[PDB]
Amino acid sequence: ADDMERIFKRFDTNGDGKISLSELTDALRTLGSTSADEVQRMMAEIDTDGDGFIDFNEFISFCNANPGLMKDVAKVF
Template sequence: MSPNENSNVVTKPSMYLQDMSEVEKVFQRFDTNGDGKISSDELSGVMHALGSTTSPDEISRMMEEIDSDKDGFINLQEFADFCKADTGDGGVGELKEAFEMYDEDGDGAISIGELHLILTRLGEDCTLQDCEKMIKSVDADGDGSVSFAEFKQMMTNNKK
């Protein structure tokens, strides 16, 4: 990602969360110590695990935007509200950004190895075989990897 001149704009989550149980699962992934709130350190840690070089200033801006009650933490309701926010472009830009984080080698496809690497960084206990099953479940053209079109199809769940 290249630095943006208009760096006061905070990007929305790079996924479409279809229901509250999905929101809770993602929230729990960010809430690494399990205290029911996301600190700036936890947010920074997840961003780093995803391969983002988010600066401390950017983390602060993200916290300010999401932390509506200004207690210094993001609670589940604030996170859910943020996930529901309209991005204006139908989320395509955010999806592309998420895809690029998984596509470590920049070849335009997410391989089994790349998926395994990212999930391992995020603390998931999964095998290469688990990742292969995940890839196969969305690999429409059968090439053994996930293209952006397949990723978009999976993440948007056919919704516009």
């Protein structure tokens, strides 16, 4: 039972293997996140294909990095 799994599936409402990393940073604004601007530049780190999608390894790399964004995000997962 992983926490990052829930959030990862949160955006994955299309039954896909990846989730848009662009809509995330822009979506966090609704979650009440005050780092939507910092997350936008952070999500780019996990993205190695610079595409509008991220897999489990990508999304995870964000948390494993402990940047300080997913810390508060996963808290409301």
